[PDB]
Structures are given as C-alpha cells and as structure tokens.
Amino acid sequence: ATLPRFDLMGWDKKDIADPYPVYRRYREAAPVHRTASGPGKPDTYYVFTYDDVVRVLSNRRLGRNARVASGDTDTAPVPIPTEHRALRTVVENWLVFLDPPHHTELRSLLTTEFSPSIVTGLRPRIAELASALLDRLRAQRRPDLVEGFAAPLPILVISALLGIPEEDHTWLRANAVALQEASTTRARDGRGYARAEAASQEFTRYFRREVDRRGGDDRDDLLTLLVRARDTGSPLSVDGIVGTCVHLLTAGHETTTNFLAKAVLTLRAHRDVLDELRTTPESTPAAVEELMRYDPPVQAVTRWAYEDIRLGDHDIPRGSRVVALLGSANRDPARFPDPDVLDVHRAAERQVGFGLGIHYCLGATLARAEAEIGLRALLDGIPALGRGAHEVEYADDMVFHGPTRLLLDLP
C-alpha cells in the first residue's frame, strides 16, 4: 500500500483550515477508504468521490441509527455516551438523525414554515438585522466577525421563527457552542461531553419553559405550531419538541455562521473575486453557490448500513458506519473541472453542501437568503474587508467546519 488509514480526528490546525490537499491524495487513490476501529466498534468507510457521496446520501439502505444497523439494543442510537442522558435525549430527537416514517412525519410538519414564499417575506428584515449588527461593529476597534456578526445574524433570524427573545442571542450562542463539543469529530479530552450535557439541560429547561408558556396570547412561531400539534393529537412528546427547537437553533445558525466567516476568508484569498463582487452585486447569488461548492460549512455527514452495500472498491457489511465527505465531493475534478479554482460562473448547483436525498437541508432556501443578504452586508458595510490583517482560529471540528472567531484590523 501507499496511504495509511484515514479519519477526521486529531488534525492539526493547518489541515483543518485547508483539508482539500488531504481529500485529494485519498480521492486519487480510491473513491472509498475503510478504517478499522478495534473492539466491538464498527468499521467506518469514508467516501471521497462526488458520485459515491451522492450514492451515500441517496441509497435507502443507509440510515441514521447505529442501533438499527447493528440490531443490537446495547449500541447507542446516536454517537453520545449513555452517561450523558440529557445530551442523548436532545440529540436523538434531532430530525437529521431520524428515519422514516418518524422522520417523514416531522419534516412534513416542519417544512411549510421554511418555504420560498416565507423566506422572501423575511429578506427585508434579514437585511435590517445585518445592517444593525454591522452598525454596532464599527463602535469597536478590533471586531470579531463571528461573535459580532456571523453568529448573531442567523440566531436572531431563527429565534424569531421559533418565537424566542432576541435578547437571548448571546446565551443561545454559548450553549450551542458548548453542545457542539459533543460532535463526533471533536477533541473531547476533558469535559467536552460534560459541558455539552449541561448545555443540553439549559436548553431543555429554557425550551420546556417556552412551551408551558404556549398558552399565552398565541402566535405562530415554530414553538406554538409544535405545541398545538401535540395538543391536537400529533405523535409528539415534549422532549421531541425540545429537541426540535434545539435542532432548529443549532442547525439554523452554526452552518450559516461558518459559511459567512469562511466566505470572508475565501474572498480575502481571492481579491479579484472580492473586488468583482464589490462592484457587481448581481453576481452575489452565483458567488454564494460557488462559495458553497468551494469550501462547504459541513465537511462530513454520516450514515449507517442497514444491509450490505457495495461502494467503490468495498463491500460494506451491515452495521458499518459510512462517512460522506461533502468537502471532498465538491472538489472532485470528475464533476468540477479545476476544482481548486474559485469560479463564480461555473455551474455549481451540483455542489452537495446542502446534502441530498431525504435529509436534504431543510432550510436551504433560508440559508441561501441569509448567505447572500449576509455577505452583501459585509461587502457594502466594510470597505476594508479585503485589506489589512486578520486573525482567525478554526474550531477543532470537521463536521461543522469553520472559525471560532475572526478579528479584523481595519479601524
């Protein structure tokens, strides 16, 4: 052989920031690579090719539950230790980790609230939010584009849909970050899990509070929608509602946050595109799409084999974990010529940054709206966005991929 075993763990900051050279070396050797774990831990098959990633997200014998895959009561349905019960409850209640029919019933109840029509009515306001955020960020000397903008924008947006207090955007953010340490490609040397556990509890109480208050002066916000469904007979527990709010809050902003932050990083490394964008704003929609293919906010998603499946050079046994490398698929030259070139005129609707299949990003249209309106705000409100120095720290995360913070030195 030539290449050693591949996994998303313990990577140095250099590779986390620019993982593409790694996906390339592996993609060129084989579309699928398998990595053995050692005990009663199942093998994992990493998919690097576009076509095979498509197959991972599409084939229905791949599911989200490792317990269903192994047919073993002992194995955890989701990747969180039993020790952490509040965390486990919250996570196994996320739509992304559900299988049909439960998954179908929930998405169905939820999708009407994120329609193209509703996103269009939201734009003028997503615009005043960004403007106000940037307005505030000039008041300070070395602004953090993440805490001061990339995070607050999508949190305030989803907070309104949910029907929660705008004033809680900082509290919401910190608990979402604490919970993120439970993500499967994190360090977790010392209390990542304990913190995520406590965060989960904070969200449980916060959201349990919100619903016992859903006999009030009755709005329409996901919360009410959710509570009214249960009250009228829908198969929904308060844990399920709680988990959904947590899922919508986290999945509803951490992704957009990373897109916005990394987009600033990408445009800075591609000044011709950045300057082209500053002068011709009609290119914004095409830029977003290409920025997404170029450096997707979500680098890896997992699935579990419910039955034997053949992919690439491998015969994946039932019970095997399967990882679709979105970032690697978006830079596969077989699908995107000159993949490392940031070209905003290429056809990129093909990119799998929003996923594919039944779990296709639920807020894609909302995400796209926050992305263009978002980076528009940055482009027009910060002339020196592409000048001067910047400092960034990437999170040790290969699922939700991006900066923990990004300070700029334009006064």
Ligand code: HEM
């Ligand atoms: C530009 C930012 C965003 C990106 C890159 C993104 C990306 C993704 C990806 C790749 C998945 C699939 C994961 C898998 O197959 O395991 C996903 C799922 C999901 N996203 Fe997004 N997302 C973004 C914004 C949003 C927003 C603003 C919301 C609004 C609440 C949202 C809600 C969801 C939900 C609910 C799911 C799970 C749906 C299901 O399992 O059927 N996302 N997202």
Ligand SMILES: O=C(O)c1[nH]c(C(=O)O)c(-c2c[nH]c3ccccc23)c1-c1c[nH]c2ccccc12
């Ligand atoms: O048990 C689960 O529900 C699970 N779900 C996932 C996932 O990523 O969806 C994992 C997992 C996360 N990282 C892994 C590496 C090798 C094998 C499994 C995993 C696991 C997992 C972690 N440790 C395990 C030990 C035995 C069986 C499954 C897992």
Ligand SMILES: O=C(O)c1[nH]c(C(=O)O)c(-c2c[nH]c3ccccc23)c1-c1c[nH]c2ccccc12
């Ligand atoms: O940690 C993982 O391995 C993972 N895998 C996925 C996936 O969808 O395959 C997620 C995940 C959870 N919500 C998501 C929204 C968009 C994209 C990915 C996710 C996650 C994930 C993100 N944050 C987490 C916190 C706790 C447990 C899992 C995740």
Ligand SMILES: O=C(O)c1[nH]c(C(=O)O)c(-c2c[nH]c3ccccc23)c1-c1c[nH]c2ccccc12
């Ligand atoms: O200049 C500041 O006030 C500052 N404050 C911090 C901080 O961490 O609070 C930094 C800084 C230094 N190294 C960092 C890495 C990631 C994020 C921020 C930094 C910096 C910083 C050092 N060099 C810079 C260049 C551009 C922007 C900020 C900084």
